[PDB]
């Protein structure tokens, strides 16, 4: 019905993603190669196969793209300042041969300002270097650590590359009671997933005062991609022999609902597309592989999706999936007025047959 049609329209969005991939993949496959031999601190920075990977998981604009460059680090130490797992600042432990990054410090903390400035300098040098690939670097703004690089083409396209430290050590102590996929994927999958590395993306609090630019937030987008691709408690479910379970499709249509709401109306700019994913990850552990993940009754799939979403909005609680003591939308982070409006909007679009999906 409307849901299958919207899913086909998401496939059309995949076609547009291919149209963008045509230029961005070509750019990166020849741009990243200069980084390794440049003989700097950013040498050895390699893109991590995370995010959409041509899929719809990115949740970015139709003419915009995003990718992340994972730079490894020696012995990252994490400290959470005046926050609850939502923001972290990096320091270093004893390293016998000095830090490779011993000149990006601000005392003991390693700040995103110096690293991103050096990163953008190197990127601008490279884009001015190669002539075969038509690449540029648009001017910088102080509101985002994304070193955007607008690409000239018959039709304008832009991309941005986000630095993200990579740490091979244990996960942070704020995630111990997180990622509850035990009854769903099994304790084996978890304990073999909390061995992977974790990333730190540079993010400014923009609400505190003491340290603004010198703060990094955890990123587990690789584990997120893992769980999206090979979902299910049956090893062949969506891996072979048919057996099409509709749980990713429900997430896609919910994400489209949120995006259409945010584009249609203004104040919903304070809730990104990531909250929907956290809701779905908290919900999939609510009922491991019931009979109600079948292609039929999919309207029931969305009844329950909304049910959970509205329940989180009304009670003022939705914990970050990996950090279970970090309310993504709360009064302190987001006052109650906007989320009250969002709950009203979800209620309304629940009724009247979802008018938001007529103009799509």
């Amino acid at each position: 019905d409307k849901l299958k049609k919207v899913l086909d329209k998401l496939r059309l969005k995949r076609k547009d993603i291919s149209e963008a991939a045509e230029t961005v993949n070509k750019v990166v496959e020849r741009l990243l190669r200069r980084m390794q031999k440049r003989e700097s601190e950013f040498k050895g920075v390699e893109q991590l196969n995370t995010g959409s990977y041509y899929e719809h998981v990115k949740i970015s604009a139709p003419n915009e793209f995003d990718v992340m460059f994972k730079l490894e680090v020696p012995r990252i130490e994490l400290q959470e300042y005046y926050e609850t797992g939502a923001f972290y600042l990096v320091k270093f432990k004893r390293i016998p041969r000095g830090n490779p990054l011993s000149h990006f410090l601000e005392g003991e903390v390693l700040s995103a300002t110096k690293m991103l400035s050096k990163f953008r300098k190197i990127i601008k040098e490279e884009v001015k270097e190669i002539k075969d690939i038509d690449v540029s670097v648009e001017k910088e703004k102080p509101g985002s650590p994304a070193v955007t690089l607008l690409i000239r083409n018959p039709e304008e396209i832009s991309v941005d590359i986000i630095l993200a430290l990579e740490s091979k050590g244990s996960w942070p102590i704020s995630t111990k009671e997180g990622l509850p996929i035990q009854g769903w994927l099994g304790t084996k999958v978890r304990t073999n997933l909390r061995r992977e590395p974790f990333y730190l993306v540079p993010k400014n609090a923009k609400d505190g005062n003491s340290f603004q630019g010198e703060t990094w937030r955890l990123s587990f987008s690789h584990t997120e991609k893992y769980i999206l691709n090979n979902h299910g408690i049956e090893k062949t479910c969506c891996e072979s022999s048919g057996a099409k379970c509709c749980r990713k499709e429900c997430l896609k249509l919910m994400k489209y609902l949120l995006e259409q709401l945010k584009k249609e109306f203004q104040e919903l700019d304070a809730f990104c597309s990531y909250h929907v994913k956290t809701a779905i990850f908290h919900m999939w552990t609510q009922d491991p592989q019931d009979s109600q993940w079948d292609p039929r009754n999919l309207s029931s799939c969305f009844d329950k999706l909304l049910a959970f979403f509205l329940e989180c909005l009304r009670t003022e609680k939705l914990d970050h999936y990996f950090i279970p003591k970090f309310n993504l939308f709360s009064q302190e982070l987001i006052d109650r007025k906007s989320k009250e409006f969002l709950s009203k909007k979800i209620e309304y679009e629940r009724n009247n047959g979802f008018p938001i999906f007529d103009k799509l």
């Binding site: 016998p96 050590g169 304990t191």
Partner: protein
Amino acid sequence: KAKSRSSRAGLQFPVGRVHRLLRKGNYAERVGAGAPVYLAAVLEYLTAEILELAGNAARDNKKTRIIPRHLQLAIRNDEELNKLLGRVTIAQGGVLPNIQAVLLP
């Protein structure tokens, strides 16, 4: 009431037990108030420094526990710890796998 001396200092190791050990052992006629706090902090630092590397060695082995084979690859792959424990045998640890390149064919 009744705060423990090792909670004020922010430590996990026992400041009170360390002070008692310093007093009962024949180290000096007196022991200040900042000696147990300094020494417990240093001992906790070193213990965490060994245990984190040992845990990384355990985890890349795809295990969930630390065995003496992991406290050997952590002391003997580190410049400074290897030199702090160079005259020490870790029972059931083995050796570090090095073979001279003139023996390879």
